[PDB]
Amino acid sequence: AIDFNDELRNRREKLAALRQQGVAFPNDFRRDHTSDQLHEEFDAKDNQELESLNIEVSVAGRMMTRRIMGKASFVTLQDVGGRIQLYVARDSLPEGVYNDQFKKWDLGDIIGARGTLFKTQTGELSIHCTELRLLTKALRPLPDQEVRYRQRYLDLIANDKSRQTFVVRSKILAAIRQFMVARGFMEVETPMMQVIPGGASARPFITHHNALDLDMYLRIAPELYLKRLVVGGFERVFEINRNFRNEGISVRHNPEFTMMELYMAYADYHDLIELTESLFRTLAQEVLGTTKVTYGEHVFDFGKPFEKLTMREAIKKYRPETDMADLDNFDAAKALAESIGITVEKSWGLGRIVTEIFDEVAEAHLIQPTFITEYPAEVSPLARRNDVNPEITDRFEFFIGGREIGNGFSELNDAEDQAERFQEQVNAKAAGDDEAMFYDEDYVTALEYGLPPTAGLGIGIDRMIMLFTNSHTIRDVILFPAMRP
Amino acid sequence: AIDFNDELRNRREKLAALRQQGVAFPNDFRRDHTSDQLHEEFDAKDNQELESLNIEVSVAGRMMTRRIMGKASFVTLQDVGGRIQLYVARDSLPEGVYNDQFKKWDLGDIIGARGTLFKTQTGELSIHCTELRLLTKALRPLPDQEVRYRQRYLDLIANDKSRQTFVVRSKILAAIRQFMVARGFMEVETPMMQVIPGGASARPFITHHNALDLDMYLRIAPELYLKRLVVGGFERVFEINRNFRNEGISVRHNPEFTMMELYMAYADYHDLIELTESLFRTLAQEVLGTTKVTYGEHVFDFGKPFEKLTMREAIKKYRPETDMADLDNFDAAKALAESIGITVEKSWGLGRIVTEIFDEVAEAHLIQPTFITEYPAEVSPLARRNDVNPEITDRFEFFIGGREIGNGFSELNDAEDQAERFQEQVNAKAAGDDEAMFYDEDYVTALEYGLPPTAGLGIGIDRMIMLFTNSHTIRDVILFPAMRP
Ligand SMILES: Nc1ncnc2c1ncn2[C@@H]1O[C@H](COP(=O)(O)OP(=O)(O)CP(=O)(O)O)[C@@H](O)[C@H]1O
Ligand SMILES: Nc1ncnc2c1ncn2[C@@H]1O[C@H](COP(=O)(O)OP(=O)(O)CP(=O)(O)O)[C@@H](O)[C@H]1O
Ligand SMILES: N[C@@H](CCCC[NH3+])C(=O)O
Ligand SMILES: N[C@@H](CCCC[NH3+])C(=O)O
Ligand SMILES: [Mg+2]
Ligand SMILES: [Mg+2]
Ligand SMILES: [Mg+2]
Ligand SMILES: [Mg+2]
Ligand SMILES: [Mg+2]
Ligand SMILES: [Mg+2]
């Protein structure tokens, strides 16, 4: 209770004492090894070996634990690579350091140590310190679950599992780039500020550029710009960056999230299906050591093909009582839709209602890797029409763990059709659809110059990271998730 | 004049004819080679060799040029890797293709070809087509300088030099990551939407999050979040992403630009100076093949140390007539400042005026790689104070080609000092400084838990790319620069 305030008072008083002595906050100590390096290299050597090698190293980190036993102590130092034990002895350090300094320090304090490696009777790798310094005084003692999000640094200091989650996220992004580049893809960068937002359907964030007295939009998707690059000649491009959607927070929704969009000319959605399967198998194998991944109560085998269902087969499979003929009739579909809780807006058509039904009915049950094809043209304004049935498109979305992970399709490279579809989106917007697309004249012009047959894929990176770190809330894979006021 | 509209009419009419025949826009052709691959591998083989090897390949791209000579033609195909010549002959292709299809195509059209490699009497690598298809009909013929920016796809189709500029940008970013990772740095991702913007001084873009009825800011810098990660334990992190500043457009300013911020604990600004020099020498050598880089009328040798000057030495060197004692006196400095065109605001102090003078006086003359040290504390609220003189900080900025490229310093890990400095920024904001920092309580708290001595660096990526692609306007290295309405 009050013992905490005594901790705050004592650390502050110790700091004041540091200031009277000299520079309380130096920046002079330099280390040459991190704990993980020392371990990877010397964990297999016995004390006899280490005695002869007589390796002196320098490390620095946070004092996590400390057991003072008179003239000698044991300290656990935590750094970027993990933890390493220090053997701090009064007679090994310069006169007075052990008693006048070391013993006056506190857990949480950042310290630097230089000394010889050896192993304790316990067999643990440790450093016999010949030099020890206080680099940074911690004014606060070492540390619902929203606290972990409101002060991620504390979450990272305290929980090894949180740290590993984020290190795996980095390993995954690096592996994705290596994977993409090995396939001749080039990473580009398009605008995050757009005069005309597009490439998806969502409520956007609006801002104002003072210099140009112009209203701008945070991008909801880089699609329209990436395909312009394909027209220009960069036939294998990809971008990995944020998208911003003015929607609410959820266990699978952050208003700003990371997405990877890729485009490859002379390919169709089938080529995206193989690329996607190959990417997951690679990430699992390369990052987790195996293709069988445990996620909650399930196990995904990324060494096996994903399941493939059409949107209608998915509705029928997860709501078997459904009279499928209902979906081929607006009045019947509207009724079906509303009967399950969907508020059918007046701008919606058959294809939109069916997609909404699929979302409500099947989405959550797609636990094992699954591709859902045959997305209606009405909800896919930028996708290539199906050769046989124009009302559906060469589009698919894939799901894992009951969540939408990606969205990919054979791109629409028919400028006249693109214009019409943009017009329909504009009519819809005028009819109430506040998420409908804006008409983009320049995009249509780019298409008029000629876009090669192309296939594009969009994968939610945050959601994909959940599946590889066994996280069940997107907030567990985003360092600083959007917090409610 | 009207011949252009005849081109538009003719392509549109040819398309209509395509639609009557079947699917005007197929997505079925697949290639197995890009021009650069064919060249890298077969440019050194003579026709006798290629005759025996009898290599059949498949390519696809834009028809750039075409010379029809009766029953045979020569075509130049442009793809992601460059150009390759095709030898299209009536008797090599299936009956009627050459005459009924090929000859009716137009430049700009996207085509696919399959055939055997060989070399022309000219010695150029070419493909003897056995199959040729029209993949995408171009409805528009092949293509101030703002047009290149308003329709970058045309700029990319037309100019090989623009394409190479962007390919080098990608090569550079990839090399930076490889460089950072080899040094144990981990790439993270912090928020682009912030409730309290900070980490720099600039007018920010403001937006509104509907769900939380909250006003948000596009980030001007990721600094405050990256250092929180250092407190948490990620001692070697970096981020490469956009920053948004609500300022005007210039030859060195885009309202949204790419920046790389890196932080390494147990290091000071000197370590950043070596890292910076090492990074440029590496990029030049690895990406351009040499450390001597030509930029306009100059040559930068990245194999040689950068120049180092204090902010005051730079002012004296580029305005020798200046009585330096003036800079140590507010009234005299204000006068000096105003006499050279600087409007001194009422919230400014000596350190701010001096920095402004440096900007006006020396900045533009720093052509060769130069580090400018001793930035005043007043304009560096997050930098470590100088041990000897508290009024200046362990901060530097480096310039090349007369432009600021980077900004780095020994981080301020003194929470009490950080709070005071934030308070001063708040007073300044209240005194008119619309670019002053916001007070961030949580950031100070993070510091209270303890930030290790650290060094952080911020490099403007767009500006750095200019120096490596001989570009003299930032708009030449950003695929889609901010265009005036
Ligand atoms: N708010 C958000 N937070 C995180 N990822 C998101 C997101 N909104 C969309 N995504 C991701 O972007 C991908 C492509 O965007 P899309 O337009 O398909 O989103 P969506 O609205 O269908 C996702 P959901 O169906 O879960 O609401 C999604 O498959 C998902 O991976
Ligand atoms: N509008 C802009 N466009 C492009 N790069 C920019 C930029 N504003 C700043 N930068 C880059 O970010 C770096 C760090 O930000 P900083 O706060 O130092 O900018 P600044 O305002 O000093 C740049 P200048 O002095 O050219 O106006 C700069 O050194 C520069 O490389
Ligand atoms: N832009 C899409 C992802 C890529 C679609 C394929 N071209 C989205 O945000 O859903
Ligand atoms: N945040 C700084 C760059 C890094 C400064 C070093 N900590 C800027 O925008 O200028
Ligand atoms: Mg959504
Ligand atoms: Mg969805
Ligand atoms: Mg979707
Ligand atoms: Mg500026
Ligand atoms: Mg400046
Ligand atoms: Mg600056």
Q: Give the residue ranges of DSSP H helices in A259-369.
A: 269-283, 311-318, 330-339, 350-361
Supply B421's token pair: 């400095």
CA B209 – CA B227 distance, rounded (Å):
26
CA B216 – CA A485 distance, rounded (Å):
11
**CATH number reported for the structural domain that contains residue B239 in this entry:** 3.30.930.10
**DSSP SS3 for A11:** helix
CA B129 – CA A224 distance, rounded (Å):
34
Say if residue A202 is in the same domain as residue A273. Answer: yes
Cα torsion B138, B143, B149, B153 to 10°: value is 30
CA neighbor of B479 nearest in space, from B254, B286, B171 = B254
Q: Would you tell me the crossing angle of helices A330-339 and A350-361 to the nearest 10 degrees?
A: 30
B25–A413 CB contact, under 8 Å: yes
Supply B205's token pair: 């873009």
Q: Which atom of ligand 4 is nearest to the CA of B222?
A: 1
Within 10 Å of residue B49's Cβ, how many Cβ atoms?
A: 11
Task: State the method.
Answer: X-ray
Supply B402's token pair: 């007369």
CA A368 – CA A15 distance, rounded (Å):
55
Residue among A137, A167, A205 minimizing CB distance to B207? A205
CA neighbor of B422 nearest in space, from B192, B193, B222, B198 = B198
A468 to chain B, minimum CA–CA distance in Å?
A: 17
Contact B156, B142 (CB under 8 A): no
Residue numbers in B near A245 (CB within 8 A): none
Say if residue B79 is in the same domain as residue B10. Answer: yes
CA of B229 to the centre of ligand 7 (A): 32
Asked whether residue A374 is marked as a ligand-binding residue, the answer is: no
Question: What resolution in angstroms, rounded to 1 decimal?
Answer: 2.4
| B405-B406-B411 Cα angle (round to 5) | 170
**Closest chain B residue by Cα to residue A113:** B266
Say if residue A75 is in the same domain as residue A176. Answer: no
Contact A108, A62 (CB under 8 A): yes
Bridging pattern class, strands A256-265 and A454-460? antiparallel
Contact B327, B354 (CB under 8 A): yes
Say if residue B395 is in the same domain as residue B282. Answer: yes
Q: Could you tell me if the CB of A351 is within 6 A of ligand 1?
A: no
Longest dimension (CA), chain A: 89
Contact A447, A417 (CB under 8 A): no
Question: Phi and psi dihedrals of B80, rounded to 5?
Answer: -60, -30
Within 10 Å of residue A105's Cβ, how many Cβ atoms?
A: 19
CA B152 – CA B144 distance, rounded (Å):
13
Instruction: Give the residue carrying structure tokens 């007075």.
Output: A96
Counting the structural domains of chain A, the total is 2
CA B464 – CA B448 distance, rounded (Å):
35
Question: Phi and psi dihedrals of A411, rounded to 5?
Answer: -65, 150
Say if residue A379 is in the same domain as residue A263. Answer: yes
CA A136 – CA A124 distance, rounded (Å):
27
Say if residue A98 is in the same domain as residue A187. Answer: no
Say if residue B72 is in the same domain as residue B128. Answer: yes
Contact B423, B199 (CB under 8 A): no
CA A189 – CA A172 distance, rounded (Å):
20
A450–B384 CB contact, under 8 Å: no
Say if residue A216 is in the same domain as residue A263. Answer: yes
What is the residue-wise DSSP string for B378-446? GG-TTBPBPSS-TTBBSEEEEEETTEEEEEEEEB---HHHHHHHHHHHHHHHHTT-TTPPPP-HHHHHH
Contact A474, A253 (CB under 8 A): yes
> Looking at residue A392, what DSSP letter applies?
B
**DSSP SS3 for A466:** helix
B202-213 as b/e, with b when 16 or more CB fall inside 10 Å? bebbebebeebe
CA A121 – CA A117 distance, rounded (Å):
13
Pocket of ligand 4 (CB under 6 A): B 199-200, 221, 223, 261, 407-409, 411, 456-458
**CATH number reported for the structural domain that contains residue A79 in this entry:** 2.40.50.140
Bridging pattern class, strands A236-244 and A186-187? parallel
Asked whether residue A397 is marked as a ligand-binding residue, the answer is: yes
Write out the H or E segment, with its range, that includes residue B396.
strand B395-400
CA B448 – CA A7 distance, rounded (Å):
12
Which residues neighbour A95 within 8 Å (Cβ) at sequence distance 6 or greater? none
Q: Which atom of ligand 4 is nearest to the CA of B261?
A: 4
Contact A235, A264 (CB under 8 A): yes
CA neighbor of B337 nearest in space, from B429, B364, B351 = B351
How many residues would you count in chain A? 485
Supply A422's token pair: 């943009």
**Closest chain A residue by Cα to residue B138:** A450
B441-480 as b/e, with b when 16 or more CB fall inside 10 Å? eebbbbbbbbbbbbbbbbbbbbbbbbbbbebeebbbbbbb
Say if residue B100 is in the same domain as residue B32. Answer: yes
- Counting ligand 1 atoms within 8 A of each CB, the residue from A205, A393, A404 with the most, and so the one to mutate, is A404
B315-338 as b/e, with b when 16 or more CB fall inside 10 Å? bbebbeebeeebbeeeeebbebbe
**Which residue of B57, B153, B196, B416 to mutate against A (max A Cβ within 10 Å)?**
B153
- Domain finish residue from B123, B143, B163: B143
Contact B303, B292 (CB under 8 A): yes
CA of A314 to the centre of ligand 5 (A): 19
Within 10 Å of residue A203's Cβ, how many Cβ atoms?
A: 15
- Domain finish residue from B88, B108, B143: B143
Longest dimension (CA), chain B: 89
Residue A134: alpha-carbon gap to chain centroid: 35
Which residues neighbour B65 within 8 Å (Cβ) at sequence distance 6 or greater? B75, B76, B107
CA B481 – CA B251 distance, rounded (Å):
11
B27–A394 CB contact, under 8 Å: yes
Say if residue A228 is in the same domain as residue A290. Answer: yes
Residue B212: alpha-carbon gap to chain centroid: 34
> Looking at residue B411, what DSSP letter applies?
B
Contact B79, A233 (CB under 8 A): yes
**DSSP SS3 for A109:** coil
CA B442 – CA B196 distance, rounded (Å):
10
CA B167 – CA B161 distance, rounded (Å):
10
Say if residue B134 is in the same domain as residue B183. Answer: no
**DSSP SS3 for B174:** helix
Phi-psi region of A107 (alpha: psi -120 to 50; beta: other; left: phi over 0): beta
CA of A406 to the centre of ligand 7 (A): 8
CA A111 – CA A26 distance, rounded (Å):
11
**Closest chain B residue by Cα to residue A443:** B151
Instruction: Give the residue carrying structure tokens 């060469």.
Output: A394
CA of B407 to the centre of ligand 10 (A): 6
- Domain finish residue from B108, B123, B143: B143
Burial of A213 (0-12, 13-18, 19+ CB in 10 A): exposed
Q: Which residues pair with A410 in a beta bridge?
A: A455
B247-268 as b/e, with b when 16 or more CB fall inside 10 Å? bebeebbbbbbbbbbbbbbbbb
Domain that includes residue A43, residue range: 4-143
Residue numbers in A near B151 (CB within 8 A): 442, 445-446
CA neighbor of A228 nearest in space, from A478, A485, A443 = A443
Phi-psi region of B410 (alpha: psi -120 to 50; beta: other; left: phi over 0): beta
CA B350 – CA B338 distance, rounded (Å):
13
Say if residue B73 is in the same domain as residue B135. Answer: yes
